[PDB]
Amino acid sequence: MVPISPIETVPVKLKPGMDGPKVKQWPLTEEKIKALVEICTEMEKEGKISKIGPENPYNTPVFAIWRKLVDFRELNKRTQDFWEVQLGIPHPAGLKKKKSVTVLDVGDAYFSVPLDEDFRKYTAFTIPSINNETPGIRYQYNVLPQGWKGSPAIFQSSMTKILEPFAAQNPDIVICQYMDDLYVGSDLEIGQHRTKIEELRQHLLRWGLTTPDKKHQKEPPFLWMGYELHPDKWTVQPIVLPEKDSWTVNDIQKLVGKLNWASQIYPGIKVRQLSKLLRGTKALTEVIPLTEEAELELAENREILKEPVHGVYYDPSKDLIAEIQKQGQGQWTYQIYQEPFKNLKTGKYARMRGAHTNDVKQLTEAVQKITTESIVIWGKTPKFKLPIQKETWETWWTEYWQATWIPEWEFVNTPPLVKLWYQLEKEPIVGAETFYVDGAANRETKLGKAGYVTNKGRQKVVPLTNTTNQKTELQAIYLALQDSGLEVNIVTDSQYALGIIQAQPDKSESELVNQIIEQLIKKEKVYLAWVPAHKGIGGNEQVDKLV
Amino acid sequence: IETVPVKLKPGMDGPKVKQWPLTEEKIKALVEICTEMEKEGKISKIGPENPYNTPVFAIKKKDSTKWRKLVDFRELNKRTQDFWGIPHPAGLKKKKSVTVLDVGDAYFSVPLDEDFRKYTAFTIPSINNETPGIRYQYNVLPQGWKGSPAIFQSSMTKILEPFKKQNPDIVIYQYMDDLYVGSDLEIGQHRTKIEELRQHLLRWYELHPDKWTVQPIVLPEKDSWTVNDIQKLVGKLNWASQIYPGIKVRQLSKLLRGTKALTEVIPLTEEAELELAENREILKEPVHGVYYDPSKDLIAEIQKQGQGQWTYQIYQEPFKNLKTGKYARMRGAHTNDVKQLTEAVQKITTESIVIWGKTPKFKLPIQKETWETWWTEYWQATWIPEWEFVNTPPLVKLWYQ
Ligand SMILES: COC(=O)Cc1cc(Oc2ccccc2OCCn2ccc(=O)[nH]c2=O)c(C)c2cc(C#N)ccc12
């Protein structure tokens, strides 16, 4: 017998202060008991488990469905935390094309890696006796049990330690681990590739690991985690938008799942309205009628999902490009590619939850998201194609009160373009009328007034019902913008209004702010000056709006 | 050569912080560095039984193309037991010049407590999560951990004993991996003395706090005032009245009586000139009742002024500034706001380390996603302070300008 190399055990403990599981065994039928006795007999004959005496005080329930199913939920609750290395699956767009790719599934994955002997006593389980007229048969696991908390992590680390020297002495191949399957890829000739696959099967056999003796039953295309992997391209598994007479909540969440999933390769997928119908519902069976915006959006989705689209693999020798397009209502879409019309992947970005916003901020956020995703997938920041003029970005970041930055990018003239809709003046305007505005409201009756007085003797006071102080300050500025020429100075004491306008929004929740924006867009020059209230500053008439 | 027992605070587990994505060049640099360190016993590979993790990335310090390994030990530092203390040298900020030295290598010759090593675990990530991440844990004192200068304090005292006995006029301070050496010599004599101390440390950053002062509130001196000029003056004075008690603005607001155009020139009455002069005299004095409390956090606010100019204030209570400043240095960051902000944060943190011996909590005028996407690209210090993000434009921006 050729000496099998031992696999180093991973020292495992329980959570601090906790003890092993002690759960009462369930009564089983005589048929199930016989089945479990046969299965456990064979497993003991193989070495996966071993019989134990009555000294072991721990127990974990067992079932038969025949196949044995040990319910380790209690031991999982009581087992220490492990370093789970599977967090975020590899994205197909990050893979690099290989001439040959082979799949090797390892038989008896967990049942070939030994378990820490000082921990085996916590895996104890008992098989009930026929009519329970004898003590049940007590067993404990000698290898990683399927369903235990630490089986995937320990299996992955052991497989990594085994595959380390082979990967070191074979730099011309790439190996990838995923559950009980290994994916090897290389650009060598098919003969050299199959040869090195044989060498890998041998190197794994030196540790007692069995690979498919037959030809590997998995051949391209590979169906993996909703993906289709082909020798030269990748895509998502078929996305079918169903025809429904009425759409319920679960149908709409299925639809937004298929659309969110399909959006990573199908460009232009929009999900704003269909997900907007789910706002504050929290009812899985509630039927929600579809708005016309959602029906037209669904028609555009069916038009995009008409025929299959594929993505290419990553070529590290070519530059990485990401182009962004604005879609409206806070929706953005992007393609990441290296050659024109041949996308690596696609995606979308929806604006965050905010009361005020503008397009430049949203474009910046989208660029940051794409940057992080690209560093994840490809390990580098792509060059950007953005629908915004260089001069627009320069004016924005040079005049913005916050720090902001975009990585290397170039302008692409693909409408709609992102632009600055208004710019406030830095110094007061000579020859322009000066509007001193103010607004006030009563906290009880919700009655208020908003108005202005100007240097030319122009005045206005408007009464308002169902209003607040902030609303009357915004309304006062709005009136000043309504009744002034193309150039105007405005003096206010509202720190709230100045805080809104200095954030430079082009779209808001409050229709009042949106009207202020529409007025600013029409002006030539607007200078907004702030003064403290109640300081006896003439012109700023707080008593004119408190009557 | 003998390990000192180190534990965590009662009731606190080890740090379990997610490792953020790194570029390919940084991953390669960390692989090379960590391989070299593993060959030297400074770190060792760990198995999946270690659930703890601390972020790690790579930088390139000043005047060097070699990559350096930086570990974000912030969580481990706040979860590590308090080590005890040496009173802060109040004369370090008074000295004419100070030079910062990196003494991190000296930490790697002292072994780390055996049972504490599992808490220093870090992970070199992989691109696209293809292969598992390379996990390491430290066997010696790691750079960036607060326990490394606390444990090495005795050895550092023994090494620096001859030099401190040789020059009683040279002040020596230590914070994390940095050694601050202050004196009053000439720049050439200071550089030769620094080479003397660095070879003295071998066989075993010009910074001038004297050219730094606290900044007063200044008012304009004009011959003709417009309505806008007086309105801004009254706004700034009303703001300063929160700091200085005797500020009075009624005689200047008396000039704004009537709705006048913003560009109209207004002459100052005698009462207004007297009021403005009294306000100047009040502003010339320091702030009433401003003290430092070592039990409280330091807060640093930064305002972007444009044209590469930045203003900052370090305080503990609102309107009680312990330090104010204006960083306007231009060093290869003319077209990048984030790089400017990051160098500003590093400089302010260094000043705070010199003055009080600890780092402040920053309030950054930047969106969380932008800063968290780009700040590691321009970081060159061995420590990392805490920060939060201000999303509403502060009105007091121009009152510090
Ligand atoms: C962690 O591994 C991954 O997630 C990537 C991963 C890589 C992989 O294959 C590879 C193995 C080693 C290096 C590159 C690989 O893909 C390059 C791109 N590709 C892909 C398919 C093809 O024919 N031809 C190609 O040139 C396979 C075959 C996978 C198969 C399944 C399945 N079922 C799941 C993931 C897989």
From Swiss-Prot, chain B:
Changing residue 378 to L: No effect on RT p66/p51 heterodimerization. Changing residue 48 to G: 74% loss of polymerase activity. 86% loss of RNase H activity. Changing residue 61 to Q: Strong decrease in RT binding affinity for all dNTP substrates and in catalytic efficiency. 100-fold decreased sensitivity to ddNTP inhibitors. A motif (Tryptophan repeat motif) lies at residues 371-387. Changing residue 159 to L: 80% loss of DNA-directed DNA polymerase activity. 23% loss of RNA-directed DNA polymerase activity. Mg(2+) 1 binds at residues 102, 177-178. Changing residue 179 to A: 76% loss of DNA-directed DNA polymerase activity. 60% loss of RNA-directed DNA polymerase activity. Changing residue 176 to L: 90% loss of polymerase activity. No loss of RNase H activity. Residues 40-207 form the Reverse transcriptase domain. Changing residue 148 to A: 74% loss of polymerase activity. 56% loss of RNase H activity. Changing residue 239 to T: Complete loss of polymerase activity. 87% loss of RNase H activity. Changing residue 176 to I: 54% loss of polymerase activity according to PubMed:9533880; increases polymerase activity according to PubMed:9657675. No loss of RNase H activity. Changing residue 235 to A: Complete loss of polymerase activity. 25% loss of RNase H activity. Changing residue 374 to A: Almost complete loss of RT p66/p51 heterodimerization. Complete loss of polymerase activity. The record marks 374, 387 as: Essential for RT p66/p51 heterodimerization. Changing residue 178 to E: Drastically reduced incorporation of phosphorothioate nucleotide. Loss of pyrophosphorolysis (reverse of the polymerase reaction). No effect on RNase H activity. Changing residue 145 to A: 73% loss of DNA-directed DNA polymerase activity. 70% loss of RNA-directed DNA polymerase activity. Changing residue 374 to F: No effect on RT p66/p51 heterodimerization. Changing residue 230 to T: 96% loss of polymerase activity. 45% loss of RNase H activity. It comes from the Viruses. Changing residue 70 to V: No loss of polymerase activity. No loss of RNase H activity. Changing residue 175 to F: 70% loss of polymerase activity. No loss of polymerase activity. Changing residue 272 to L: 68% loss of polymerase activity. 10% loss of RNase H activity. This is p51 RT.
